C-alpha cells in the first residue's frame, strides 16, 4: 500500500542524488534521528559521495549538522568519512564522527538534549537551510508521520527554508498513531505555553508533524534499516549493580519514601542502565511507568512482560533482535508507547512534576560525587551529555551507575577528582557499582566521600582513594571539600603516562 | 496597633528564653530567612547562650539548621560562635559560620535553592522537629504574615512537629499583602501541581502562610533589625562590566533577538550583579520586569525610577539605607513587588517559561567557560551555589559577571581549569569582565577558549592562558577539550604556595 497518501505531493518525489544537490556548502542542516532511530539515510550517502568529489577538485563542501541526538552509519558515519561536517550538535555515537571531533576536524558542542530546539529557535546554530526528515508516511492532508523517533523534527521543519522528506518503506506502517506532536509553544518565543502533561501516558497533541507544503522541496523514497547496535551481554557487574539498586528500591518502598509501583522511570543510553532494566523485568515491582528519553531493549522487555504499563520517550533505541520483535507485534506495542518531541520528553518542568527516577551511566565520579559523563582524561569526547543533565537535575532521585573500574581494571571509575564535570554534587544522590551502593542524600561533601569510597570504589583502589582523602583532610587549603591540587588529577596523568592508574 | 490579631493565640506568647527550651539537642530546625531578610532573631540568641552553658558542663547541644538561604548575625553568627550547629543547609554568608564549615566543624551541603523544600519533604534532612519563623503579624483566622522574605517557611511549617513564631515589630506592617503563598503542591509528593504562573506579576495564592494552630508551641514578640550589609561602592570594574552588558543588550534588541523591554530579569546575590543593575537604572531600556530570587538595592532602585515596572522574588536583600527607603515608602513599593516561595521563585519550569535572563557573579571560569561559584582553590567554601543553578540552566540567556582578577591582581578569575565546577559549559552563554564580553552561543569548547581569552582575561594573564591553550592543543590526550593535566590546576597551587598566580 502507498505511503504518500496525499496525491499532490507525489509530484515532488525525486531521487536521493538529485535531492542532495539542494544542500549547499556552509548550510546548517537539521535532521531527524535520535539514538540511532529515524535518521535520514539515502540523501546523506548521496551527499557524502558528492562531497568527496568536490574535495578532489579542491572545492570546499561542508555542512553544520544539527540533529535530535545520535544517528547512524548512513549519516554520521558517511559524512565523517567524507569529511563533510564543520559543526555538529548535540549528540553522537559514531566512531568516524567521534574521531573527527577528537582530532579537531569537526567542531562539537553537546547541548542538553531538551534545550536544543529552544536554542535552534533562538538562532544559536545560525539559520537553518535544510530540514531533512525521515517519515513513515504522508497523510492525506500533508502531515508527516515520523518513524522510530520524534526528536527535534518538528522544530527543524518549522525553521528550515527548504524541506526534504525520506519516506522509508522499512519502517512499520503501524508506527502511525504512536507519536504525540504538540502545536503548543514549548521551545519558541517566550512566554511559552504550559505543557499540560500531568500523566506519563497523557496525549496532548496529534499523530503527525506539520509543515507548509510549499517548503517541501523534495521527497525521496527509501528502504533502509535503522542500524542500531546490539546491547552488550549483561555480565557479572551488570547483575550486581541491578541487585543493589533493586534492594534499594525495596527499602525505599518499605520506608514509604516510594510507592510500590515506584515512580516514572528514566534510563539513559548505554549498556549498564539497560542491564539494570533487565533486572527489573524480573523484580517484585509492578504497574511501572516509563518517562524517559529512550526506550532501550530492556524497557521494551518490561512492556512485553507487563511489568511496565506504559512508556513515554522520544525514540526507541533497540538492538536488531528487539527491533524485529516490535516490527512484528507492532499492533501490541503501539498502545504501550508514546513517542514525544525531545523538548517535551526532556522538559525539566514535566520531569520534576511527574517526579521521575533518573538512572544514568557515567565515565567516572570523584570521591565527592561530581560526575563525568563525556570526556575521558578531561579532553577526549565519548558520546555527549545527552539528556543526563535534563533528568539528573530535574528528577525526584538521581542515580548513577558504573563498573567500579574501566579498561580491564587499569582505570578507576572513582577518582580523587573528575577530569571533566557534567553533573555537580547537587545533581547526584545515589551511586551504584558492583561493589555496592552509596546513598548521599543529606550529606556534606566529606560525608559523601566516606560513602563513595567505602561502598562503590574497587578494592584495588579504595586504599589509594582513602589515602588521598586522609591527606587532603590534613593539608587542603580549605577543609569543606578537601583536595591536594598537586595530585588531584595525577591518576589520569599516570594512566596517560603508563597505561594504568595502578602504581608500579 | 496589635500585631497578633487573632486573640486566642496571644495566650501562647512566651519569652524568647522559654521558647528556646523547646529546641532539643539533635533537632532538625527549619527557619525563615533568605539573603539576610526575615530570619528569626531572638530565639536563636537565647538558644545560643543556653548552648554554651550546656557545653561548659560537658553536655552535647547541637542542631541541624535548615533555612531558606543566608540569614544574619543573630542566627548563623550566634550559633556558629556557640558552636551549636552540626549540620547546615543550603546557603550561608556569615563569617563565623563560614569558618566552622571550612574547618570541618559544621557539616554543609549547598542544595539548589529551588530544590530545598522538595528535598526536605522527601526526608533528606531528616524529620523536622522545629519550624522557627519570623512574622509581620498574625491574622484574625490564624494566618502568618511573612516578613522581608518567604523562602521555605511554608514547607517548614508543614513539616515541623512544633512551631515557634516571632512577631517582629521592626518589620513594616504594610508588608501584609505583599506575599503570594500557594496552597498548590509545588514541592510535595508527585504528581505535583502545575504552577500556573504565566506572567511575572501574576498572583496565584494568598497573603499568608497557613499552619495548624495546635502546632504553634510558642509565639515570641520581638523588635530587631534585618542586619543586611551595605553594597560595595561600584568601582571601575563594575561600570565597565555594566557598559559591555548594556551594549550587548542593545545589539540583541537591534537584531530582534530580544524585545525593547528585554525579558524578565534575574540578578544574583553579590556586589557585581548589583552594580550592573545600577547601570540599567540609567540605561535606554524601559518596561522592565524582574523575575528573580532576590531584590537587591539596585533592583529596588529601578522600581523607584519606574524603569522596572514590577519585580518578583523570594526576598529583598537591601542595604541599611535602602531598607530605610522602603520602610518609609512601603505604600508605593508594596504594589511593585511580589514575594513568593523560593520553590516558586526558583522553579525551573517557570523560569524557562517566562524566558528569564540570568545574571550571576562567579569566583572563576576556566578557558572553556566552566564556572566556579563556591569553592576557592576547590576546597574552601565561600557562600554557596544558591539559585545560580536554578536560573543559569533554566534561563533564556545565562550570563556570568566578574572582575577579571581577584585579590588585588594576585589571582586570575580566568584559569586553565576551574578548581571546582558549579556551572558546566552548557549552562553559560555569556561572560563579562572589565576587559570585555564573550558571546559563546553556538561555539565548540575550543572556540569558547579563543573568545574567553581574547575578550575577558586580564592582560597580565592573557599570554599565560594563551600559552597553556596553545600547548594543550598540541599535546592534550584528546583535542576536543584540550588540557595539560600536569599544569591544569598549577595556577591554584602556585597561589597556595606563593600568594600569587603570577610567576616570579
Ligand atoms: C539519550 C539520553 O541522553 C538519555 C539520558 C541519559 N544520557 C546519557 O547518560 C548520555 C551520556 N552517557 C553515556 O554516553 C554512557 O552512559 C557512558 C558514560 C559512555 C557509559 O557507557 P556504558 O555503556 O553505560 O558503560 P561502559 O560499557 O562501561 O563504557 C562504554 C565506553 O566508555 C568507556 N569508559 C567507561 N568508563 C570509562 C572510564 N572511567 N575511563 C575511560 N573510559 C571509560 C568504556 O571503556 C567503553 O569504551 P569502549 O567502547 O572503548 O570499550
Ligand atoms: C540568592 C541567589 O542564589 C540568587 C541567584 C544567584 N546566586 C549566586 O550566584 C550565589 C553564588 N554567588 C556568590 O556567592 C557571589 O556571586 C560570589 C561568587 C561570591 C561573587 O561575589 P561578588 O560580591 O559579586 O564579587 P566580589 O566582591 O568580587 O567577591 C566576593 C568575595 O569573593 C572573593 N573572590 C571573588 N573572586 C575570587 C577569585 N577568583 N578567587 C578568590 N576569591 C575570589 C572576593 O575576594 C571576595 O572575598 P572577600 O570578602 O574575602 O574580599
Ligand atoms: Cl511547563
Ligand atoms: Cl540533599
Ligand atoms: Cl509548573
Ligand atoms: Cl549553544
Q: What is the DSSP string of B188-230?
A: SSSSPPP----STT---SBSSB---TTTEEEEEEE------PP
From the alpha carbon of B266, which atom of ligand 2 is closest?
5
Cell of A430: 545515589
- Report chain B residues whose CB lies below 8 A from the CB of A376: 477-478
Residue A265 and residue B199: Cα distance in Å, rounded? 32
Contact A489 B493 (CB under 8 A): no
Q: Using CB atoms, which residue from A263, A477, A493 is nearest to B485? A: A493
> Which of 183-242 (A) contact B at CB < 8 A?
189-194, 196, 198-199
Asked if B393 is an interface residue toward chain A (Cβ–Cβ < 8 A), one would say yes
Is the CB of A86 inside 8 Å of chain B's CB atoms?
A: no
Cα–Cα distances (Å) from A388 to A119, A399, A412, in that order, read 18, 10, 21
Q: What is the dihedral of CA A194, A198, A200, A206, to 10 degrees?
A: -50
Measured CA to CA in angstroms, residue A67 lies from A133, A152, A286, A314 at distances of: 10, 7, 35, 13
* CA proximity to B315, closest of B168, B148, B176: B148
CB contact under 8 A, B380 and A257: no
CA B3 to chain A, closest CA, distance in angstroms equals: 37
Quickly list DSSP for A178-190. -EEB--S-SSSSS
d(CA B485, CA A420): 11
CA distance B390 to A392: 13
What distance in Å separates residue B258's CA from the closest CA in chain A? 10
CA-B364 nearest atom, ligand 2: 39
**Secondary structure of residue B103 in the 3-state scheme:** coil
Q: Cell 556557640 belongs to which residue?
A: B82
The reply to whether residue B352 touches residue A192, judged by beta carbons under 8 angstroms, is: yes
Q: Which residues of B121-145 are buried (b: 16+ CB within 10 A; e: fewer)?
A: bbebbeebbbbbbbbbbbeeebbbb
By most ligand atoms within 8 Å of CB, the mutation choice from A39, A386, A399, A433 for ligand 1 is A386
Interface check A102 vs B, CB under 8 A: yes
Q: Closest ligand 2 atom to the C-alpha of B272?
A: 24
Nearest-angstrom CA–CA distance, B238 and B223: 36
Chain length of chain A: 504
Q: Give the cell for residue B434.
A: 572589565
**Contact yes or no for A431/A457 (Cβ under 8 A):** no
Q: Is B387 in the pocket of ligand 2 (CB under 6 A)?
A: yes
Report the separation in Å between the CA atom of B318 and the middle of ligand 4, taken as the mean of its atom positions: 29
Q: Cα–Cα distance between B47 and B356 in angstroms, integer?
A: 41
Question: What cell numbers appear for B373 in the block?
Answer: 561559584
B115 with A426: Cβ contact below 8 A = yes
Q: Which residue of A has its CA nearest to B112?
A: A426
Measured in angstroms, the resolution is 2.6
Cα A435 to Cα B496: distance, rounded to the nearest angstrom: 36
Return the CA Rg of chain B.
23
Domain ranges of chain B: 1-504
Residue pair A220/A42 in contact (Cβ under 8 Å)? The answer is yes
Q: Pick from B254, B259, B318, B308: which is nearest to B286 by CA?
A: B308
Residues B290, B281: Cα–Cα separation, whole Å: 13
CA dihedral of B271, B273, B274, B279, whole degrees rounded to 10: 130
Q: Which long-range contacts (CB under 8 A, 24 or more apart) does B324-333 make?
A: B325/B300, B326/B172, B326/B300, B327/B172, B330/B172, B330/B174, B330/B175, B331/B174, B333/B300, B333/B303
Distance B382 CA to ligand 4 centre (A): 19
Contact A109 B199 (CB under 8 A): no
Method: X-ray
Residues of B in contact with A254 (CB under 8 A): none
Q: How far is A393 from chain B (nearest CA, A)?
A: 9
Nearest ligand to the C-alpha atom of residue A344: 3
Phi, psi of B340 (to 5 degrees): -110, 170
Q: Distance (Å) from the C-alpha of residue B320 to the closest C-alpha of chain A? A: 32
Across the interface, whether the CB atoms of A101 and B480 are under 8 A apart is answered: yes
Contacts of B450 (CB under 8 A, 6+ apart): none
* Nearest ligand by distance to the CA of A425: 4
- With CB atoms and an 8 Å threshold, state whether B426 touches A389: yes
Across the interface, do B122 and A441 touch by the CB < 8 Å criterion?
yes
Query: Which residue in this structure is represented by grid cell 554520521?
Result: A76
Length of chain B: 504
Interface subset of A 335-364, CB within 8 angstroms of B: 347-350, 352-355
Q: Give the count of Cβ contacts less than 8 A between chain A and B.
A: 231
* Secondary structure (DSSP) of A347-401: -HHHHHHHT-EEEEE-SEEETT--EESSEETTTEE-S--TTHHHHHHHSSEEEEE
Q: Are strands A337-340 and A179-180 parallel, antiparallel or unpaired?
A: parallel
Ligand 2, from B245, B339, B382, B391: best to mutate by most atoms within 8 Å of Cβ? B382
Hey, is the C-beta of A377 within 8 angstroms of any chain B C-beta?
yes
**CB-based burial, A160-180: b 16+ in 10 Å, e otherwise:** bebbbbbbbeebbeebbebbb
The ligand with the least distance to the CA atom of B429 is 6
Burial class (CB in 10 A: 0-12, 13-18, 19+), B378: buried
- Is the CB of A474 inside 8 Å of chain B's CB atoms? no
Ligand 2 proximity of B403 Cβ (cutoff 6 Å): yes
User: How far is it, in rounded angstroms, from Cα A466 to Cα B401?
Assistant: 37
| Rounded Cα–Cα distance for residues A174 and A151 (Å) | 19
| Cell numbers at A196, concatenated | 499540560
Name B279's Cβ contacts closer than 8 Å, sequence gap at least 6. Answer: B238, B239, B242, B243, B245, B246
Name the one residue in this structure whose C-alpha cell is 511573612. B146
Question: Could you tell me which chain B residue has the CA closest to the CA of A428?
Answer: B111
Burial B19-51, CB ≥16 within 10 A → b, else e: bbebbeeebbbbbbbbbbbbbbbbbbbbbbebb
Contact call for A108 and B444, based on CB within 8 A? yes
Residues 6+ away with beta carbon under 8 Å from B71: B31, B33, B36, B39, B92, B94
Q: Is B270 in the pocket of ligand 2 (CB under 6 A)?
A: yes
A-chain CB neighbours of B444 within 8 Å are 87, 107-109
Mutate to test the interface with B, among A407, A444, A490 (most CBs of B within 10 A): A444
Cell numbers linked to B497:
604556595
Q: CA–CA separation, B57 vs A125, rounded Å?
A: 67
CB atoms within 10 A of CB A330: 15
Q: Which atom of ligand 2 is nearest to the CA of B413?
A: 39
Distance in Å, alpha carbon of B314 to nearest chain A alpha carbon: 20
B377 touches chain A (CB under 8 A): yes
φ, ψ for residue A160, nearest 5 deg: -65, 145
Who among B103, B123, B198 is closest to A479 (CB)?
Answer: B103
A87: exposed, middle or buried (C-beta count within 10 Å: 0-12, 13-18, 19+)?
buried
Residue A149 has a CB neighbour count (10 Å cut-off) of 33
Amino acid at each position: 500500500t502507498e505511503r504518500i497518501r496525499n496525491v499532490a505531493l507525489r509530484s515532488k518525489v525525486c531521487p536521493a542524488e538529485t535531492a542532495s544537490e539542494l544542500i549547499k556548502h556552509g548550510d546548517v542542516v537539521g535532521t531527524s534521528g535520535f539514538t540511532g532511530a529515524g535518521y535520514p539515510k539515502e540523501v546523506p550517502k548521496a551527499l557524502a559521495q558528492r562531497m568527496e568529489a568536490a574535495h578532489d577538485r579542491g572545492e570546499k563542501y561542508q555542512i553544520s549538522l544539527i540533529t535530535g541526538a545520535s544517528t547512524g552509519p548512513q549519516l554520521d558515519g558517511e559524512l565523517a568519512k567524507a569529511n563533510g561536517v564543520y559543526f555538529r550538535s548535540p549528540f553522537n555515537t559514531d566512531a568516524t564522527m567521534r574521531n573527527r571531533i577528537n582530532a579537531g576536524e569537526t567542531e562539537y558542542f553537546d547541548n542538553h538534549l531538551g534545550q536544543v530546539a529552544g536554542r535552534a529557535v533562538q538562532g544559536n546554530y545560525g539559520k537553518f537551510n535544510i530540514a531533512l526528515v525521515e517519515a513513515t508516511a504522508i497523510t492525506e492532508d500533508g502531515g508527516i508521520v515520523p518513524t522510530s523517533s520524534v526528536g527535534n523534527s518538528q522544530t527543524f521543519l518549522n525553521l528550515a527554508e527548504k524541506v526534504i522528506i525520506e519516506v522509508n518503506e522499512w519502517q512499520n506502517p503501524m508506527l502511525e498513531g504512536i507519536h504525540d506532536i504538540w502545536d503548543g509553544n514549548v521551545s519558541g518565543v517566550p512566554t511559552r505555553d504550559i505543557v499540560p502533561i500531568v500523566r506519563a501516558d497523557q496525549r496532548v497533541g496529534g499523530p503527525v508533524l506539520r509543515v507548509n507544503p510549499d517548503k517541501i522541496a523534495a521527497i525521496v523514497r527509501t528502504n533502509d534499516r535503522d542500524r542500531n547496535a546490539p546491547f552488550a551481554a549483561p555480565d557479572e557487574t551488570a547483575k550486581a549493580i541491578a541487585g543493589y539498586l533493586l534492594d534499594f528500591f525495596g527499602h525505599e518502598v518499605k520506608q514509604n519514601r516510594l510507592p510500590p509501583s515506584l515512580l516514572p522511570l528514566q534510563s539513559g543510553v548505554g549498556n549498564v542502565a539497560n542491564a539494570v532494566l533487565e533486572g527489573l523485568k524480573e523484580g517484585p515491582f509492578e504497574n511501572l511507568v516509563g518517562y524517559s528519553a529512550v526506550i532501550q531493549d530492556g524497557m521494551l522487555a518490561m512492556l512485553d512482560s507487563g511489568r511496565m504499563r506504559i512508556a513515554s520517550a522520544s525514540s526507541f533505541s533497540l538492538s536488531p533482535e528487539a527491533a524485529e520483535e516490535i516490527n512484528n507485534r507492532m499492533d501490541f506495542f503501539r498502545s504501550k508507547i508514546i513517542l514525544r518531541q525531545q523538548d517535551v520528553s526532556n522538559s525539566p518542568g514535566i520531569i520534576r512534576r511527574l517526579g521521575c527516577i533518573a538512572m544514568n551511566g557515567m565515565i567516572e565520579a570523584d570521591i565527592y560525587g561530581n560526575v563525568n559523563s563525556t570526556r575521558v582524561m578531561g579532553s577526549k569526547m565519548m558520546n555527549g551529555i545527552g539528556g543526563s543533565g535534563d533528568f539528573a537535575r530535574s528528577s525526584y532521585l538521581s542515580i548513577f551507575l558504573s563498573p567500579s573500574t574501566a579498561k580491564g581494571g587499569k582505570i578507576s571509575a572513582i577518582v580523587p577528582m573528575a577530569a571533566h564535570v557534567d553533573h555537580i554534587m547537587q545533581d547526584a544522590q545515589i551511586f551504584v557499582t558492583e561493589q555496592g551502593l552509596a546513598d548521599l542524600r543529606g550529606l556534606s561533601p566529606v560525608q559523601r566521600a566516606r560513602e563513595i569510597i567505602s561502598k562503590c570504589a574497587h578494592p584495588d583502589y579504595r586504599p589509594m582513594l582513602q589515602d588521598y582523602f586522609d591527606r587532603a583532610l590534613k593539608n587542603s587549603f580549605g577543609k569543606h571539600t578537601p583536595h591536594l591540587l598537586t595530585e588531584a588529577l595525577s591518576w589520569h596523568q599516570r594512566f596517560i603516562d603508563t597505561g594504568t592508574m595502578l602504581p608500579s
